Design an enzyme around this catalytic site. Structure first.
Site, PDB file in Angstrom:
ATOM      1  N   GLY A  76      47.433  54.071  43.952  1.00  0.00           N
ATOM      2  CA  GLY A  76      47.692  53.784  42.900  1.00  0.00           C
ATOM      3  C   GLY A  76      48.407  52.098  42.509  1.00  0.00           C
ATOM      4  O   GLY A  76      47.893  51.474  42.904  1.00  0.00           O
ATOM      5  N   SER A  77      49.087  52.184  41.557  1.00  0.00           N
ATOM      6  CA  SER A  77      49.645  50.907  40.806  1.00  0.00           C
ATOM      7  C   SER A  77      50.601  50.090  41.869  1.00  0.00           C
ATOM      8  O   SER A  77      50.672  48.593  41.538  1.00  0.00           O
ATOM      9  CB  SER A  77      50.794  51.117  39.676  1.00  0.00           C
ATOM     10  OG  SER A  77      49.968  52.159  38.715  1.00  0.00           O
ATOM     11  N   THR A  78      51.016  50.338  43.082  1.00  0.00           N
ATOM     12  CA  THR A  78      51.446  49.564  44.007  1.00  0.00           C
ATOM     13  C   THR A  78      50.429  48.334  44.475  1.00  0.00           C
ATOM     14  O   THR A  78      50.682  47.456  44.882  1.00  0.00           O
ATOM     15  CB  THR A  78      51.779  50.455  45.450  1.00  0.00           C
ATOM     16  OG1 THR A  78      50.874  51.435  45.668  1.00  0.00           O
ATOM     17  CG2 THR A  78      53.244  51.127  45.294  1.00  0.00           C
ATOM     18  N   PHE A  79      49.046  48.954  44.340  1.00  0.00           N
ATOM     19  CA  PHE A  79      47.822  48.149  44.860  1.00  0.00           C
ATOM     20  C   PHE A  79      47.529  47.326  43.837  1.00  0.00           C
ATOM     21  O   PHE A  79      46.925  46.324  44.102  1.00  0.00           O
ATOM     22  CB  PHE A  79      46.653  49.188  44.806  1.00  0.00           C
ATOM     23  CG  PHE A  79      45.422  48.371  45.609  1.00  0.00           C
ATOM     24  CD1 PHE A  79      44.548  47.978  44.751  1.00  0.00           C
ATOM     25  CD2 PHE A  79      45.229  48.794  46.836  1.00  0.00           C
ATOM     26  CE1 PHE A  79      43.663  47.252  45.328  1.00  0.00           C
ATOM     27  CE2 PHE A  79      44.251  48.151  47.450  1.00  0.00           C
ATOM     28  CZ  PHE A  79      43.250  47.515  46.716  1.00  0.00           C
ATOM     29  N   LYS A  80      48.429  47.173  42.482  1.00  0.00           N
ATOM     30  CA  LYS A  80      48.086  45.947  41.439  1.00  0.00           C
ATOM     31  C   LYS A  80      48.397  44.773  42.191  1.00  0.00           C
ATOM     32  O   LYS A  80      48.027  43.828  41.767  1.00  0.00           O
ATOM     33  CB  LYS A  80      48.690  46.387  40.241  1.00  0.00           C
ATOM     34  CG  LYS A  80      48.021  47.967  39.507  1.00  0.00           C
ATOM     35  CD  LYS A  80      48.683  48.140  38.162  1.00  0.00           C
ATOM     36  CE  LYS A  80      48.235  49.379  37.579  1.00  0.00           C
ATOM     37  NZ  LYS A  80      49.005  49.690  36.538  1.00  0.00           N
TER      38      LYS A  80
END
Lengths: 5, 522
Positions: free
Chosen positions: B243-247
């Protein structure tokens, strides 16, 4: 998601 | 002996111990050959005297003493793992036919403690021989095993094949003190949320040393409780749609290519990709806003925009240079490679905000380390040394290695500035992660989880895998803490709202406190 608050 | 497993401070995590087993000869044949009886002569009073130690029902002992006319009898699991001071107590009763035989058992002082990393060694009934079945114990079996000195092989980690015997000791990077904070906080999360999957890892920001790691649902190495349900180690073997950790990585890429300007306004809201309205978490957007904000908020549209500006082919290579889709070449067995979802535009887009693409939690630590070490990703490692304590000979010694520099020093400082904002901004949608006295930064990580076997995603009220990739003190950190939770079964609403904040906060606070990092204000 990301936030939610 | 099977060698010992130590932490970085030299505290024992696993060792062999000598315990004892109760045996009772019930058959008169034993005493037929000599004067002093060698079989239980007064079943009744022998049973009472033994009802002093252990699973003491005198009648249940008499039932067992009364069975058939078998020569010798055991007492199930109660008739094993008897301590030395239990032995001494009985030996003074000098009972006819009663004896305790020594047996070696593997002892884990902490019980349930980094269960999935340490691993578990099983005993062969006949020979008494211990053999690792998971974790450390399996990987390093041959070296640990004082017996197996034929050709010693490190499981899968090709090489190091060094060919009355004592075993080799395995030193980990784990700090028992930090491990406590983790186990306690995860226990808390299970009580609250009852997730299907959960982990937290503490890594030294400046070395790549794993200071603590655990997962739920784990097992108890001592007892063999829950062993084999979840075999897979979260950190090294299990994949997640992060998820958004990957942004964070999607951003770095941009910043470097010069496509991301924090003050430049972009169109938030919806994005029609392959006949689907891929939209922001709020489903409506915030209209035209600065990119800096989008990222603070965790805009899914932002990452999609940025991908378009940079270019498909280039972004794929960016994620590859951040170590994703490949093994981190860590010291663990069958480490999962994951995979970058890039088969079509949908997968590519959804990837920039952490869907389709699968990662090991470790790949993510590796990535994140870049930001605090001048664009160099650090190889995460947990094995400090394997050495025979007699000879002192080091068969392996771990050290900090640079698994790549995908990004510049300038880029890293700019990424850190945004991570600081995500938490410590006026309009932060992540204030829940803030700690008193200490400066925190990191990234919220709400994701949809895939259906285990086939289908699309899991549906429900809040079928999300929430995570936080935090670091502190801000700018010049001591540690990275990565917590992740998958499918809270209870208070799923609070889960989506707070995420893993309830676990991160205590772990980080306690750790910084223990490492004597300075405070400000309470």
């Amino acid at each position: 998601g990301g936030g939610g608050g | 002996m099977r060698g010992k497993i130590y932490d970085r401070n030299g505290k024992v995590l696993a060792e062999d111990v000598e315990r004892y087993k109760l045996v009772a000869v019930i058959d008169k044949k034993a005493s037929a050959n000599s004067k002093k009886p060698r079989h239980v002569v007064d079943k009744k009073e022998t049973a009472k005297k033994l009802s002093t130690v252990i699973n003491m029902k005198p009648e249940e002992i008499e039932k067992r003493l009364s069975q058939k006319k078998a020569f010798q009898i055991e007492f199930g699991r109660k008739g094993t793992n008897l301590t030395y001071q239990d032995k001494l107590k009985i030996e003074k009763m000098n009972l006819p036919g009663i004896s305790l035989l020594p047996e070696t058992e593997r002892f884990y002082p902490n019980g349930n403690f980094a269960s999935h990393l340490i691993g578990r060694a099983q005993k062969n009934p006949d020979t008494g021989e211990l053999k690792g079945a998971l974790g450390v114990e399996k990987i390093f079996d041959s070296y640990l095993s004082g017996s197996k000195g034929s050709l010693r092989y490190i499981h899968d980690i090709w090489g190091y094949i060094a060919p009355p015997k004592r075993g080799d000791d395995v030193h980990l990077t784990i700090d028992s003190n930090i491990q406590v904070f983790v186990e306690e906080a995860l226990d808390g999360m299970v009580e609250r949320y009852q997730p299907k999957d959960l982990f937290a890892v503490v890594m030294d920001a400046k070395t790549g040393e794993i200071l603590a790691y655990s997962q739920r649902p784990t097992f108890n190495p001592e007892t063999g409780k829950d062993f084999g349900k979840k075999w897979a180690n979260d950190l090294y073997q299990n994949t997640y749609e992060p998820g958004s950790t990957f942004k964070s990585y999607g951003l770095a890429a941009a910043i470097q290519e010069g496509a991301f300007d924090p003050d430049k306004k972009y169109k938030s809201g919806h994005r029609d990709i392959m006949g689907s309205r891929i939209s922001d978490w709020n489903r409506v957007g915030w209209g035209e806003i600065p990119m800096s904000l989008g990222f603070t908020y965790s805009s899914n549209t932002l990452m999609m925009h940025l991908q378009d500006l940079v270019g498909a082919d280039k972004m794929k290579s960016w994620y590859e240079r951040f170590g994703f889709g490949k093994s981190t070449k860590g010291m663990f067995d069958g480490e999962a490679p994951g995979q970058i979802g890039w088969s079509n535009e949908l997968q590519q887009k959804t990837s920039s905000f952490g869907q389709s693409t699968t990662v090991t939690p470790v790949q993510m630590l590796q990535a994140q380390s870049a930001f605090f070490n001048d664009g160099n990703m650090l190889k995460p490692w947990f094995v400090n040394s394997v050495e025979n304590p007699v000879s002192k000979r080091q068969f392996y010694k771990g050290q900090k290695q640079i698994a790549g520099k995908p990004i510049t020093k300038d880029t890293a400082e700019k990424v850190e500035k945004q991570l600081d904002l995500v938490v410590n901004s006026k309009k932060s949608h992540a204030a829940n992660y803030r700690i008193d006295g200490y400066e925190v930064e990191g990234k919220t990580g709400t994701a949809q989880v895939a259906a285990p076997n086939g289908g699309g995603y899991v549906k429900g009220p809040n079928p999300y895998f929430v995570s936080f990739m935090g670091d502190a003190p801000k700018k010049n950190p001591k540690v990275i803490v990565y917590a992740g939770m998958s499918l809270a079964q209870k208070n799923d609403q609070e889960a989506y709202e707070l995420g893993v904040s309830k676990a991160f906060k205590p772990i980080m606070e306690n750790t910084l406190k223990y490492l004597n990092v300075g405070k400000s204000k309470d």
